[PDB]
Design a protein around this ligand. Structure first.
Ligand SMILES: O=P(O)(O)O[C@H]1[C@@H](OP(=O)(O)O)[C@@H](OP(=O)(O)O)[C@@H](OP(=O)(O)O)[C@@H](OP(=O)(O)O)[C@H]1OP(=O)(O)O
Length: 145
C-alpha cells in the first residue's frame, strides 16, 4: 500500500472482516496526523490535542504500531516536545507520557540512527516532580502515579 507498516497486530489479519480493516487503518491514521498537527499549530491543546492523542493511543491498541518509520519518529518527536514543555500541567503531561512510552516501548523498531532524543529536558521534569520544593508546602498538588 502507501506505507510499509511497522509492528501491525497479527490477530487483525485473522479476523473475518480483515479485508475492510486496511482501509479504516489508513483513514484513521490520516485524520490523526492532520488533526493532531493542526491542533498543536493552532495551540488548542485541551479541546483537540488531547482528543487526538487519545485517538492515536486507541489506534495502537486496535491496529498495533501500523505506521511508517518516518511517521513513528515524527509522532515520537512531537510527543517528546509536548512532554518537555516547561510549565505544562502535570496531569496533561501524564497523558502525553503514556502515549510516548507506548511508541518507544518496542526498541527493535527504531535503530538509534532513526531517533536521537535529548536528555536535559527530561532531567528538568524529574527535578520538578521527584524533588519539588513547592510540594512539601502543599503549593504543587501533583498526581499520585
Ligand atoms: O500475544 P499477546 O497475548 O497479544 O501479547 C502480546 C505479547 O505479550 P506476551 O507475548 O509477552 O504475552 C507481546 O510481547 P512479545 O511479543 O514481546 O513477547 C507484547 O508485549 P511487550 O510489549 O511486553 O512485548 C504485546 O503487548 P502490548 O499490547 O503492550 O504491545 C502483547 O500483549 P497484549 O496482550 O497487551 O497485546
Amino acid at each position: 500500500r502507501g506505507f510499509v507498516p511497522q509492528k501491525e497486530i497479527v490477530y487483525n489479519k485473522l479476523l473475518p472482516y480483515a479485508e475492510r480493516l486496511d482501509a479504516e487503518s489508513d483513514l484513521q491514521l490520516a485524520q490523526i496526523k492532520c488533526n493532531l498537527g493542526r491542533a498543536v499549530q493552532l495551540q488548542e491543546l485541551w479541546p483537540g490535542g488531547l482528543f487526538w492523542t487519545r485517538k492515536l493511543s486507541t489506534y495502537i491498541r486496535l491496529y498495533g504500531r501500523k505506521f511508517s518509520k518516518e511517521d513513528h519518529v515524527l509522532f515520537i518527536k512531537l510527543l517528546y516536545e509536548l512532554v518537555s514543555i516547561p510549565k505544562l500541567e502535570i496531569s496533561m503531561m501524564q497523558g502525553f507520557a503514556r502515549l510516548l512510552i507506548n511508541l518507544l516501548k518496542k526498541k527493535e523498531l527504531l535503530s538509534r540512527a532513526d531517533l536521537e532524543l535529548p536528555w536535559r529536558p527530561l532531567y528538568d521534569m524529574v527535578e520538578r516532580i521527584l524533588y519539588s520544593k513547592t510540594e512539601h508546602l502543599g503549593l504543587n498538588w501533583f498526581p499520585n502515579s
